[PDB]
Amino acid sequence: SGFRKMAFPSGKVEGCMVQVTCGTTTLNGLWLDDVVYCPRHVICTSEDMLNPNYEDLLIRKSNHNFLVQAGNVQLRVIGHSMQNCVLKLKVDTANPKTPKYKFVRIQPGQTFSVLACYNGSPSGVYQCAMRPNFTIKGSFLNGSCGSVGFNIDYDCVSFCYMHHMELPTGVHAGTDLEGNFYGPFVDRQTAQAAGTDTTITVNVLAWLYAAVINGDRWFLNRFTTTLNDFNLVAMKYNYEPLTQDHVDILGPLSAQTGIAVLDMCASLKELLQNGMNGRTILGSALLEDEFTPFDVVRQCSGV
Amino acid sequence: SGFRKMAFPSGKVEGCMVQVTCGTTTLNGLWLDDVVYCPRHVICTSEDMLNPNYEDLLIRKSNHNFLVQAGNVQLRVIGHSMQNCVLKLKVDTANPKTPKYKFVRIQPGQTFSVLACYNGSPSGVYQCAMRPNFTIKGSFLNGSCGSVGFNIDYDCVSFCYMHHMELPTGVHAGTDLEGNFYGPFVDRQTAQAAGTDTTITVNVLAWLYAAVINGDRWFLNRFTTTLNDFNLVAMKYNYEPLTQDHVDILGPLSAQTGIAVLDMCASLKELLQNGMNGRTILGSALLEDEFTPFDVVRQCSGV
Ligand SMILES: *C(=O)[C@H](C[C@@H]1CCNC1=O)NC(=O)[C@H](CC1CCCCC1)NC(=O)c1cc2ccccc2[nH]1
Ligand SMILES: *C(=O)[C@H](C[C@@H]1CCNC1=O)NC(=O)[C@H](CC1CCCCC1)NC(=O)c1cc2ccccc2[nH]1
């Protein structure tokens, strides 16, 4: 029993983290085979953060301008190139700790683990969701750029996020490992800001199922609703619409608990219209939306 | 910016996890140098869980009754002994991945990271506090026994918890790595249950400071209180008393924010008597008590 925000074990990613320095800027890089991946804004000086032309900035660089350090061993850079908003630094040594890996872009509402790093040294690991507005609510200080987000399946690491910047509201923006930003954000200085966000409905329903599996039942009721009537309520409370595919994805949890999805939707409707009346669910006084149905199944396998 | 429940990177502990089987019972062990540590209840059969005599059960065992597997390599057991509620299985190979380590017993109100494991394979990592009643609110299924809790300081792992059992309320109980239980719990079948718990006041104040550092200020006020008047309120709301040592420990966070500790105590008094009036702090609608002052400083270093 119990239900925690749980990250994947981070050792396979720890063995990939390095430090990259260009000029006076230090951030992290990801070393896989003989390539180190990092944010291209490592090459930007304070004097040209408004409208950097990265193609020009990079043409003016040589391999020796990039200092890469893996633990206390310097890696020699033997090529450099840009891939969208990431740099690829070819080094003369393949990482002996390279795990099986993939580069996968995730969807809003999906979750992943972040290994926060500074100076190429891992500091902490935590779980995050990609919000509907393509930001993440992370925990990142100066120096954390190049830290990555990932999921692990069997022994394969699927990297899905590299950190680039913090927006004015304190949420975070970055790219996939092909260097393409999540959301309408750019690696230059603007007034860019997080757009309106919404709550991830299917995840809230998954977490209510987690709660039932863990013995929290007070929010259940004898009612059911139709999908259309539920989505009218969802729209009123800034929740994403629930689709039949979402209902299908919740099938296993519904079977395990014996509570039909539209029955649980009636509970969620009542929680949105009435609140919790001083009670808690899985130790929270808010409806939690950063657990996917797969996260719940993985963690609450057989109660 | 941002504030997350963050665990320590788990790779140094991943390299220590093994599987231990005795009879039909499989759980996890911790392999350090040439010793594997695991819960002694691995030797208990279903027929003697009410009043096992572990001294007798172990005298009837031989080394070959213990099957230890590290990845897909079997380790040969060459000695066995009991240390309080842990078994020590001497094996014929020193773990080449042994980190620098210590065995440290923690205090209630202290936090640590748990590497949940099954069949000697790490599954997830999360942060936990030792409650005042010496339970932990973990996430553990069948097979998780022998999973450990730890903190990391520089490159030294301080192991502080090994998992043994779940209580009837769904919270968890275990030992330090010397095999001594946290709290009034035993590794035999009884009606034992978690005793009354309380909220960790100094941790709530630390988290309010984290919130201020992260831009949540709505709960601040112009008032201050005395320590005695605050502790009268604490007692009414089942909070631990706040000591002058706690005030001293909060010194750095108070200096960084410019908010005196007894000024923040006045805010906490108002939150306990009035509630939050529909607002949130660091994404929570409850007062959070599983971050220590050190956790806050480590994560919110320089905003
Ligand atoms: C890389 O390590 C950091 C990570 C920041 C630091 C604080 N918290 C984080 O996540 N990235 C930055 O500091 C970027 C660097 C820019 C260089 C030029 C191209 C764009 C990225 N800057 C910011 O994250 C930043 C600047 C800024 C100014 C005003 C409001 C918000 C804001 N965010
Ligand atoms: C080891 O892997 C497990 C971990 C449990 C499983 C479910 N969640 C956990 O944390 N440990 C157990 O199953 C113990 C084994 C006992 C063997 C004999 C000596 C004491 C431990 N049992 C329990 O955790 C347990 C049994 C039980 C019965 C009734 C109410 C609660 C309860 N808890």
Residue numbers in the entry:
A (entry chain A), B (entry chain A): 1 to 303
Authors' own words:
Mpro is a three-domain (domains I to III) cysteine protease involved in most maturation cleavage events within the precursor polyprotein. Active Mpro is a homodimer containing two protomers. The CoV Mpro features a non-canonical Cys-His dyad located in the cleft between domains I and II. The first ORF (ORF 1a/b), about two-third of genome length, directly translates two polyproteins: pp1a and pp1ab, because there is an a-1 frameshift between ORF1a and ORF1b. These polyproteins are processed by a main protease (Mpro), also known as the 3C-like protease (3CLpro), and one or two papain-like proteases (PLPs), into 16 non-structural proteins (nsps).
The oxygen atom of the aldehyde group also plays a crucial role in stabilizing the conformations of the inhibitor by forming a 2.9-Å hydrogen bond with the backbone of residues Cys145 in the S1′ site. The cyclohexyl group is also surrounded by the side chains of Met49, Tyr54, Met165, Asp187 and Arg188, producing extensive hydrophobic interactions. The indole group of 11a at P3 is exposed to solvent (S4 site) and is stabilized by Glu166 through a 2.6-Å hydrogen bond. Interestingly, multiple water molecules (named W1-W6) play an important role in binding 11a. W1 interacts with the amide bonds of 11a through a 2.9-Å hydrogen bond, whereas W2-6 form a number of hydrogen bonds with the aldehyde group of 11a and the residues of Asn142, Gly143, Thr26, Thr25, His41 and Cys44, which contributes to stabilizing 11a in the binding pocket. The results revealed excellent inhibitory potency with IC50 values of 0.053 ± 0.005 μM and 0.040 ± 0.002 μM, for 11a and 11b respectively.
